[PDB]
Design a protein around this ligand. Structure first.
Ligand SMILES: [Cl-]
Ligand SMILES: [Cl-]
Ligand SMILES: [Cl-]
Ligand SMILES: [Cl-]
Ligand SMILES: [Cl-]
Ligand SMILES: [Cl-]
Ligand SMILES: [Cl-]
Length: 279
Protein backbone atom coordinates (compact mmCIF):
# COMPACT_ATOMS: atom_id res chain seq x y z
CA UNK A 1 0.00 0.00 0.00
CA UNK A 2 2.47 2.57 1.29
CA UNK A 3 4.76 0.67 -1.04
CA UNK A 4 2.50 1.52 -3.99
CA UNK A 5 2.43 5.21 -3.03
CA UNK A 6 6.25 5.10 -2.85
CA UNK A 7 6.64 3.81 -6.38
CA UNK A 8 4.11 6.29 -7.79
CA UNK A 9 6.07 9.18 -6.18
CA UNK A 10 9.32 7.82 -7.49
CA UNK A 11 7.91 7.18 -10.99
CA UNK A 12 6.48 10.73 -11.10
CA UNK A 13 9.60 12.26 -9.48
CA UNK A 14 7.54 14.30 -7.09
CA UNK A 15 9.52 13.97 -3.81
CA UNK A 16 10.57 17.60 -3.99
CA UNK A 17 6.96 18.60 -4.50
CA UNK A 18 5.48 16.52 -1.71
CA UNK A 19 8.22 17.78 0.65
CA UNK A 20 7.40 21.42 -0.24
CA UNK A 21 3.74 20.74 0.42
CA UNK A 22 4.79 19.56 3.91
CA UNK A 23 6.78 22.71 4.48
CA UNK A 24 3.79 24.86 3.44
CA UNK A 25 1.20 23.04 5.55
CA UNK A 26 3.48 22.94 8.66
CA UNK A 27 2.37 24.51 11.94
CA UNK A 28 3.72 27.88 12.91
CA UNK A 29 3.76 28.64 16.66
CA UNK A 30 5.61 31.31 18.59
CA UNK A 31 9.22 30.81 19.78
CA UNK A 32 9.39 33.92 21.94
CA UNK A 33 11.63 32.46 24.61
CA UNK A 34 14.12 30.95 22.11
CA UNK A 35 14.48 34.41 20.54
CA UNK A 36 15.08 36.44 23.72
CA UNK A 37 18.42 38.27 23.69
CA UNK A 38 19.70 36.38 26.75
CA UNK A 39 19.28 33.10 24.86
CA UNK A 40 21.33 33.95 21.72
CA UNK A 41 24.29 31.76 22.80
CA UNK A 42 22.03 28.78 23.72
CA UNK A 43 21.01 28.25 20.08
CA UNK A 44 23.31 26.48 17.63
CA UNK A 45 21.28 27.72 14.59
CA UNK A 46 19.29 30.97 14.68
CA UNK A 47 16.82 29.41 12.20
CA UNK A 48 16.01 26.39 14.38
CA UNK A 49 14.11 27.17 17.58
CA UNK A 50 11.70 25.29 19.87
CA UNK A 51 8.12 26.49 20.07
CA UNK A 52 7.23 28.00 23.40
CA UNK A 53 4.35 25.55 23.93
CA UNK A 54 6.49 22.37 23.68
CA UNK A 55 9.96 23.59 24.79
CA UNK A 56 11.68 21.70 27.60
CA UNK A 57 12.07 23.94 30.68
CA UNK A 58 15.21 23.49 32.93
CA UNK A 59 14.26 23.45 36.59
CA UNK A 60 17.16 25.10 38.34
CA UNK A 61 17.11 28.78 39.41
CA UNK A 62 18.56 30.53 36.41
CA UNK A 63 17.51 30.85 32.87
CA UNK A 64 15.22 27.83 32.14
CA UNK A 65 16.04 27.75 28.40
CA UNK A 66 17.42 24.90 26.35
CA UNK A 67 16.85 24.32 22.61
CA UNK A 68 14.86 21.14 23.01
CA UNK A 69 11.26 20.16 22.33
CA UNK A 70 8.93 17.54 23.74
CA UNK A 71 7.25 15.59 20.88
CA UNK A 72 4.31 13.74 22.39
CA UNK A 73 2.74 11.40 19.85
CA UNK A 74 -0.64 10.64 21.39
CA UNK A 75 -1.94 7.84 19.23
CA UNK A 76 1.38 6.04 18.98
CA UNK A 77 1.81 6.47 22.75
CA UNK A 78 5.43 7.54 22.64
CA UNK A 79 7.23 10.78 23.61
CA UNK A 80 10.64 12.04 22.42
CA UNK A 81 12.76 15.00 23.27
CA UNK A 82 14.41 16.41 20.15
CA UNK A 83 17.28 18.69 20.80
CA UNK A 84 20.25 20.28 19.00
CA UNK A 85 23.83 18.91 19.50
CA UNK A 86 24.89 20.67 22.75
CA UNK A 87 27.21 23.68 22.54
CA UNK A 88 30.33 24.12 24.63
CA UNK A 89 28.28 26.23 27.09
CA UNK A 90 25.08 24.09 27.19
CA UNK A 91 26.50 20.65 27.99
CA UNK A 92 25.54 21.15 31.68
CA UNK A 93 22.00 22.20 30.56
CA UNK A 94 21.82 19.13 28.35
CA UNK A 95 22.59 16.69 31.15
CA UNK A 96 20.40 18.64 33.55
CA UNK A 97 17.53 18.07 31.11
CA UNK A 98 18.30 14.32 30.93
CA UNK A 99 18.22 14.23 34.77
CA UNK A 100 15.07 16.31 35.29
CA UNK A 101 13.16 14.55 32.50
CA UNK A 102 14.20 11.09 33.72
CA UNK A 103 15.45 9.94 30.37
CA UNK A 104 17.13 6.44 30.26
CA UNK A 105 18.55 6.86 26.74
CA UNK A 106 20.27 9.45 24.55
CA UNK A 107 20.25 8.90 20.82
CA UNK A 108 23.02 10.67 18.86
CA UNK A 109 22.84 10.63 15.04
CA UNK A 110 25.97 12.49 13.94
CA UNK A 111 29.71 12.38 14.54
CA UNK A 112 31.00 15.34 16.54
CA UNK A 113 32.81 16.41 13.31
CA UNK A 114 31.61 15.64 9.79
CA UNK A 115 33.08 16.76 6.51
CA UNK A 116 35.61 18.56 8.78
CA UNK A 117 32.97 20.76 10.50
CA UNK A 118 31.95 20.78 14.22
CA UNK A 119 28.32 19.59 14.61
CA UNK A 120 28.21 18.98 18.42
CA UNK A 121 30.30 19.53 21.59
CA UNK A 122 32.11 16.56 23.14
CA UNK A 123 29.49 16.39 25.81
CA UNK A 124 30.36 12.94 27.19
CA UNK A 125 33.63 11.45 28.43
CA UNK A 126 35.70 9.40 26.05
CA UNK A 127 37.89 7.88 28.78
CA UNK A 128 36.79 6.11 32.02
CA UNK A 129 39.35 7.91 34.18
CA UNK A 130 38.49 11.34 32.84
CA UNK A 131 34.97 11.99 34.08
CA UNK A 132 33.13 15.27 33.33
CA UNK A 133 31.88 17.63 35.99
CA UNK A 134 29.31 20.24 34.97
CA UNK A 135 29.80 22.83 37.65
CA UNK A 136 26.89 25.06 36.58
CA UNK A 137 24.24 22.30 36.93
CA UNK A 138 26.17 20.21 39.54
CA UNK A 139 26.37 16.94 37.69
CA UNK A 140 29.10 14.36 37.18
CA UNK A 141 29.26 12.07 34.17
CA UNK A 142 31.47 8.95 33.89
CA UNK A 143 32.11 6.56 31.09
CA UNK A 144 31.57 3.09 32.56
CA UNK A 145 31.90 1.04 29.41
CA UNK A 146 31.38 1.04 25.68
CA UNK A 147 30.46 -1.45 23.02
CA UNK A 148 31.78 -0.21 19.66
CA UNK A 149 30.12 -1.96 16.71
CA UNK A 150 30.58 -1.51 13.00
CA UNK A 151 27.65 0.90 12.43
CA UNK A 152 26.95 2.27 15.94
CA UNK A 153 28.41 2.45 19.44
CA UNK A 154 26.47 1.98 22.72
CA UNK A 155 28.00 3.53 25.91
CA UNK A 156 27.03 2.94 29.50
CA UNK A 157 27.31 6.29 31.25
CA UNK A 158 26.86 7.04 34.92
CA UNK A 159 25.20 10.39 35.60
CA UNK A 160 25.42 11.58 39.18
CA UNK A 161 23.49 14.40 40.66
CA UNK A 162 26.29 15.82 42.82
CA UNK A 163 23.63 17.63 44.95
CA UNK A 164 21.90 14.43 46.07
CA UNK A 165 24.62 11.88 45.21
CA UNK A 166 21.95 9.89 43.44
CA UNK A 167 23.25 8.12 40.32
CA UNK A 168 21.61 6.79 37.16
CA UNK A 169 22.77 4.68 34.29
CA UNK A 170 22.21 6.40 30.94
CA UNK A 171 22.51 4.45 27.69
CA UNK A 172 24.20 6.38 24.93
CA UNK A 173 23.25 5.13 21.47
CA UNK A 174 25.54 6.67 18.95
CA UNK A 175 24.71 6.01 15.27
CA UNK A 176 28.08 6.66 13.70
CA UNK A 177 27.55 5.76 10.02
CA UNK A 178 24.97 8.16 8.60
CA UNK A 179 26.41 9.06 5.13
CA UNK A 180 28.37 12.39 4.84
CA UNK A 181 26.14 13.36 1.88
CA UNK A 182 22.50 12.67 1.15
CA UNK A 183 20.99 9.60 2.78
CA UNK A 184 21.72 5.84 2.86
CA UNK A 185 21.08 3.81 -0.31
CA UNK A 186 19.51 1.29 2.12
CA UNK A 187 17.69 1.80 5.45
CA UNK A 188 19.03 -1.46 6.76
CA UNK A 189 21.65 -0.27 9.30
CA UNK A 190 19.50 2.72 10.41
CA UNK A 191 16.68 0.23 11.06
CA UNK A 192 18.96 -2.14 12.91
CA UNK A 193 20.09 0.83 15.05
CA UNK A 194 16.46 1.76 15.74
CA UNK A 195 15.67 -1.80 16.83
CA UNK A 196 18.67 -1.89 19.11
CA UNK A 197 17.41 1.26 20.84
CA UNK A 198 13.98 -0.34 21.18
CA UNK A 199 15.42 -3.58 22.53
CA UNK A 200 17.34 -1.66 25.16
CA UNK A 201 14.19 -0.44 26.92
CA UNK A 202 15.14 3.24 26.49
CA UNK A 203 11.85 3.97 24.69
CA UNK A 204 9.65 2.41 27.35
CA UNK A 205 6.98 4.53 29.05
CA UNK A 206 8.40 3.62 32.45
CA UNK A 207 11.24 6.04 31.60
CA UNK A 208 11.20 9.72 30.72
CA UNK A 209 11.33 10.44 27.00
CA UNK A 210 14.43 9.45 25.01
CA UNK A 211 16.60 12.43 24.11
CA UNK A 212 17.36 12.44 20.37
CA UNK A 213 19.78 14.78 18.65
CA UNK A 214 21.87 15.48 15.59
CA UNK A 215 23.33 18.91 14.90
CA UNK A 216 20.13 20.99 14.71
CA UNK A 217 17.85 18.32 16.14
CA UNK A 218 15.33 18.23 13.26
CA UNK A 219 16.74 16.43 10.19
CA UNK A 220 18.25 13.06 11.09
CA UNK A 221 16.50 13.33 14.46
CA UNK A 222 13.18 13.92 12.67
CA UNK A 223 13.87 10.81 10.62
CA UNK A 224 14.49 8.69 13.62
CA UNK A 225 11.33 9.68 15.48
CA UNK A 226 9.17 9.71 12.31
CA UNK A 227 10.18 6.14 11.45
CA UNK A 228 9.81 4.89 14.96
CA UNK A 229 6.30 6.42 15.33
CA UNK A 230 5.09 5.21 11.89
CA UNK A 231 6.26 1.72 12.68
CA UNK A 232 4.40 1.88 16.02
CA UNK A 233 1.26 3.04 14.23
CA UNK A 234 1.54 0.23 11.64
CA UNK A 235 1.74 -2.44 14.27
CA UNK A 236 -1.05 -0.95 16.51
CA UNK A 237 -3.73 -0.11 13.97
CA UNK A 238 -6.49 -2.46 12.85
CA UNK A 239 -5.67 -1.21 9.37
CA UNK A 240 -1.84 -0.76 9.01
CA UNK A 241 -2.10 0.71 5.47
CA UNK A 242 -3.95 3.65 6.91
CA UNK A 243 -0.65 5.05 8.25
CA UNK A 244 0.02 8.26 6.29
CA UNK A 245 3.69 9.31 6.70
CA UNK A 246 3.02 12.83 5.52
CA UNK A 247 0.21 13.19 8.13
CA UNK A 248 2.41 11.71 10.90
CA UNK A 249 5.13 14.19 10.03
CA UNK A 250 2.77 17.14 10.05
CA UNK A 251 1.56 16.05 13.50
CA UNK A 252 5.16 15.88 14.72
CA UNK A 253 5.84 19.31 13.33
CA UNK A 254 3.19 20.73 15.70
CA UNK A 255 5.87 20.15 18.38
CA UNK A 256 9.06 21.18 16.66
CA UNK A 257 9.67 23.07 13.46
CA UNK A 258 11.38 21.73 10.36
CA UNK A 259 11.46 17.99 11.07
CA UNK A 260 12.93 16.27 7.99
CA UNK A 261 15.14 18.89 6.28
CA UNK A 262 15.31 17.51 2.65
CA UNK A 263 13.20 15.61 0.14
CA UNK A 264 15.87 12.88 0.26
CA UNK A 265 15.32 12.54 3.99
CA UNK A 266 11.62 12.30 3.38
CA UNK A 267 12.20 9.63 0.77
CA UNK A 268 14.58 7.81 3.14
CA UNK A 269 11.92 7.85 5.90
CA UNK A 270 9.43 6.19 3.52
CA UNK A 271 12.07 3.55 2.69
CA UNK A 272 12.86 2.93 6.35
CA UNK A 273 9.21 2.56 7.34
CA UNK A 274 8.46 0.30 4.34
CA UNK A 275 11.48 -1.95 4.97
CA UNK A 276 10.89 -1.79 8.72
CA UNK A 277 7.25 -2.85 8.47
CA UNK A 278 8.26 -6.09 6.70
CA UNK A 279 10.69 -7.04 9.57
CL1 LIG B 1 16.51 38.81 27.32
CL1 LIG C 1 0.67 9.45 16.95
CL1 LIG D 1 28.86 -4.94 14.18
CL1 LIG E 1 9.10 -0.33 20.69
CL1 LIG F 1 23.03 16.36 11.50
CL1 LIG G 1 -2.09 8.45 9.69
CL1 LIG H 1 11.22 23.05 6.94
Amino acid sequence: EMEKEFEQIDKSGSWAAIYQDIRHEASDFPCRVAKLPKNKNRNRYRDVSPFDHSRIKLHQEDNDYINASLIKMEEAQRSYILTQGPLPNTCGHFWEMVWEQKSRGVVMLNRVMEKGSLKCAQYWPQKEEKEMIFEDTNLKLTLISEDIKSYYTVRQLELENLTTQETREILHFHYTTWPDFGVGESPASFLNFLFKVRESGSLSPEHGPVVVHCSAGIGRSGTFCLADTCLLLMDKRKDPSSVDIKKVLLEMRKFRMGLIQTADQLRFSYLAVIEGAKF
